[PDB]
């Protein structure tokens, strides 16, 4: 077990209001791992949202890039997703996923968090 990525969000949220999700990481060092934000829904399927590399760099999906913000806190082992101008379209199961070497795995895919923009 030992390494866990637990994402926590609001569950239900009113539209055009802003989303905020936190990926809480355990058992690994954020400097040595890359964390991505992804979401999944039956209608839209799997969609890559962005990522923040071990060493600061952040990349976003060119579509949502304007409504997106990704950041982190290596001291608290947390990653953040802040998406604006919510539309009932953004409802999904959100996940943070990390990649890196040195652990009993190369990848750790979080639990998921349901965001129901309604």
């Amino acid at each position: 077990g030992q390494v866990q990525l637990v994402e926590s969000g609001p569950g239900l949220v009113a539209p055009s209001q802003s989303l905020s999700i936190t990926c809480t990481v355990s058992g690994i060092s954020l400097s040595r791992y890359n964390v991505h934000w992804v979401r999944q829904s039956p209608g839209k399927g799997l969609e890559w949202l962005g990522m923040i590399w071990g060493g600061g760099s952040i990349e976003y999906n060119p579509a949502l890039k304007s409504r997106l913000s990704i950041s982190k806190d290596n001291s608290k082992s947390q990653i953040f997703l802040k998406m604006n101008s919510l539309q009932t379209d953004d409802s999904a199961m959100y996940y943070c996923v990390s990649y890196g070497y040195g652990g009993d795995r190369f990848s750790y895919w979080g639990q998921g968090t349901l965001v129901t923009v309604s």
């Binding site: 991505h36 399927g45 799997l46 969609e47 890559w48 976003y60 999906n61 795995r105 190369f106 895919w109």
Partner: protein, 113 residues
């Protein structure tokens, strides 16, 4: 725009058979520099998050059994299951990690009888 296309969208196999599912990119995912193909495979079972099975096109992840084998390169890849076992019934996606945005394939729904 790197378009990831999986195939078939669904198939029905039976226990013990070799299962073959394809994944194709609109552009080459091979980094002419380290000669690694940046493509990963995932398995998703009911109400569970997806789990990585293979990366760099052929490198199995830990705990992934020897029966799953990733192959291919450039723009055409393949996930083979040497001998399927019932527990294998799941959704299998592929994601390209070459260029941002790291898009996913549409998935192939494997049904095991």
């Amino acid at each position: 725009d790197v378009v990831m296309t999986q195939t078939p969208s669904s198939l029905a196999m039976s226990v013990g058979q070799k299962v073959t599912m394809s994944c194709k990119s609109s552009q080459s995912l091979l980094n002419i520099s380290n000669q690694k193909n940046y493509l990963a495979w995932y398995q998703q079972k009911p109400g569970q998050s997806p789990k990585l099975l293979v990366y760099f096109a052929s490198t199995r992840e830990s705990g992934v059994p020897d029966r799953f084998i990733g192959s291919g390169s450039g723009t055409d890849f393949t996930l083979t299951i040497s001998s399927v076992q019932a527990e294998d019934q799941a959704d299998y996606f592929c994601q390209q990690h070459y260029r941002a945005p790291r898009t996913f394939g549409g998935g192939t729904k494997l049904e095991i009888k």
